[PDB]
C-alpha cells in the first residue's frame, strides 16, 4: 500500500508483555560458535 | 529546528551511476519516514521514492524503479538514494522530504536544501 | 501530471487571487486530501498547506483555501511583493502506485 502511514505508531502498549513463553527455547542452536 | 542537508551530486556521464544522500539533524530519524523528490530545470515536481521508518517498505515511482535503491542507516541518520545506470532525463534537482500523514494522504512537513545531479555526454 | 493547474495567474497588490487545482474522481473526488506548496525562486517548496485548511506556523493569516467535489482552490488576499511564487497542488491518486502525485504549477504573478 503506498498509502499507508510511513511512520512509527504511537498509541501502542508500551508496557512489558506478560502474556509470553517463560519456559527455555528448545529451538535453538546447540552448537560452539565459530564467529 | 529540522536540518535537512544533502550532497553527492555533480555531472556524470550516461550509463553509469552515482549516489546522493540526505543528512538529518533536530528530530528522531528513526521514527519518521523519508521521501525523494526531483524537480528538472524548468519543471514542477516529480515524486521519486518514499521509505518506511523501519526500512520494511519500499515504493518508487515507474519511472524509476528497477533503477533507484533507496535506502537509510538509523545509527548515522542519513538516507541513501542509489542511482545506477543514469540516463539524460534523470538530470533534475533532488530534494529530500520528510513524510507526514494527516488523514488518507501524505505530505512533507520539513524540506532539505536539495542537490543538482547533472547527467549529459 | 494528473492534477491540472492554470499556468500562470496574476492581479494587482492587495487584491484576492484564486488558485484553482482541478483533479478527477480517482486523486480529488475519491476522498483524499489537497496540500498546497509555495516554491520560492531560489530555494527548495515550502509548506503551505495541509488538511485543506489547515497551515503552519510560518504561513501568514492571508493564505486559505478549501476543496469540494473534484476541485479543490487556493485564495490569497492581499497581495504583496514577496507572494510571487510557483505554487503546487498535491494529493495521491488511486490509480498510480505513488504516494504523492503533484500538479502541473501555478505562477504568481503580483503587478506591483
Known amino acids: 500500500d503506498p498509502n499507508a502511514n510511513p511512520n512509527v505508531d504511537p498509541n501502542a502498549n508500551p508496557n512489558v508483555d506478560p502474556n509470553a513463553n517463560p519456559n527455555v527455547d528448545p529451538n535453538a542452536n546447540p552448537n560452539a560458535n565459530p564467529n | 529546528q529540522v536540518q535537512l542537508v544533502e550532497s553527492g551530486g555533480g555531472v556524470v556521464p550516461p550509463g553509469r551511476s552515482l549516489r546522493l544522500s540526505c543528512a538529518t539533524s533536530g528530530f528522531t530519524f528513526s521514527n519518521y519516514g523519508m521521501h525523494w523528490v526531483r524537480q528538472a530545470p524548468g519543471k514542477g515536481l516529480e515524486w521519486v521514492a518514499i521509505i518506511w521508518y523501519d526500512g520494511s517498505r519500499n515504493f518508487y515511482a515507474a519511472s524509476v524503479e528497477g533503477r533507484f535503491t533507496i535506502s537509510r542507516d538509523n545509527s548515522k541518520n542519513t538516507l541513501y538514494l542509489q542511482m545506477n545506470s543514469l540516463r539524460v532525463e534523470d538530470t533534475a534537482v533532488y530534494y529530500c522530504?520528510?513524510?507526514?500523514?494527516?488523514?488518507?494522504?501524505?505530505?512533507?512537513?520539513?524540506w532539505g536544501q536539495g542537490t543538482l545531479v547533472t547527467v549529459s555526454s | 501530471s494528473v492534477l491540472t493547474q492554470p499556468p500562470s495567474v496574476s492581479g494587482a497588490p492587495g487584491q484576492t487571487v484564486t488558485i484553482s487545482c482541478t483533479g478527477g474522481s480517482s486523486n480529488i473526488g475519491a476522498g483524499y486530501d489537497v496540500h498546497w506548496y509555495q516554491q520560492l525562486p531560489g530555494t527548495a517548496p515550502k509548506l503551505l498547506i495541509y488538511?485543506?485548511?489547515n497551515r503552519p506556523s510560518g504561513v501568514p493569516d492571508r493564505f486559505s483555501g478549501s476543496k469540494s467535489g473534484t476541485s479543490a482552490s487556493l485564495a490569497i488576499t492581499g497581495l504583496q511583493a514577496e507572494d510571487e511564487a510557483d505554487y503546487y497542488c498535491?494529493?495521491?491518486?488511486?490509480?498510480?502506485?505513488?504516494?504523492?502525485?503533484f500538479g502541473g504549477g501555478t505562477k504568481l504573478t503580483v503587478l506591483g
Open positions: 522530504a520528510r513524510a507526514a500523514y494527516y488523514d488518507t494522504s501524505g505530505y512533507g512537513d520539513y
Open positions: 488538511g485543506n485548511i
Open positions: 498535491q494529493s495521491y491518486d488511486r490509480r498510480l502506485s505513488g504516494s504523492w502525485v
